[PDB]
Amino acid sequence: PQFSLWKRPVVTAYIEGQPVEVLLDTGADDSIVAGIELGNNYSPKIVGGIGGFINTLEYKNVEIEVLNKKVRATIMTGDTPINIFGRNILTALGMSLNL
Amino acid sequence: PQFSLWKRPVVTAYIEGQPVEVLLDTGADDSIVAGIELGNNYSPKIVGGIGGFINTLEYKNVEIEVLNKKVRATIMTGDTPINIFGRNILTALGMSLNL
Ligand SMILES: CC(C)[C@H](C[C@H](O)[C@H](CC1CCCCC1)NC(=O)[C@H](CC(N)=O)NC(=O)c1ccc2ccccc2n1)C(=O)NCC(C)(C)C
């Protein structure tokens, strides 16, 4: 692949067969997605940004599959208008930011 | 070339000659730098983030030098918990997200 940033990096990933449309965010440290069943083994946490805090639920070791690559990362469940795939996943996907 | 997302993408930049430390955020439409005086040619704007919406003072055609590039882009001042260089500078700088 290769992504020009004239339009937000929007991709389709699978959070265990569950298709979701996620944003390629080099600025997030963690990743958040909505309306996903990930089970009962979660870690309650709050995250802060611009505008304040939100409560998520951390699920470690969730297998994902994006851009023809399979990764096993950590995702949290919070309510966001848009799902984010921060660096935890980008670094795993083997993603870089070039010039 | 490329770079890694292991390292959180933090850089130093001169925002109209003030060295400012910023975060290369390819999941941000805009540029929000906190506590800097840019003048009187503003225009209040509204930016949305994860935790909510913050009120900002919009400054256009601001002179920016980052990663050894001179570029003039719209800078937004505000209450961001962290200074970000949105995709509006990422297009300008000619950056792309590769895999
Ligand atoms: C503050 C930083 C460092 C980082 C912010 C992200 O890059 C972050 C991710 C999401 C984008 C979509 C809406 C949810 C938040 N981006 C942003 O906060 C940028 C800032 C900007 N205006 O340039 N926001 C936006 O680009 C943006 C526009 C669409 C929106 C629609 C509705 C509500 C909010 C919206 N925010 C962050 O908060 N990380 C923590 C994490 C991953 C838990 C959010």
Domain boundaries, given as residue ranges, for chain A: 1-99
Alpha-carbon distance values, B54 to A20, B50, B78 (Å): 28, 10, 8
The technique by which this structure was obtained is: X-ray
Alpha-carbon distance values, B23 to A28, A69, A71, B27, B97 (Å): 10, 27, 25, 11, 15
Q: Distance between CA A86 and CA B8 in Å, rounded?
A: 11
**Ligand 1 mean position, distance from CA B74 (Å):** 18
Q: What is the CATH number of domain B1-99?
A: 2.40.70.10
Q: To one decimal place, what's the resolution in Å? A: 2.6
* A20 touching chain B per CB within 8 A: no
- Say yes or no for a CB contact (<8 Å) between B26 and A47: no
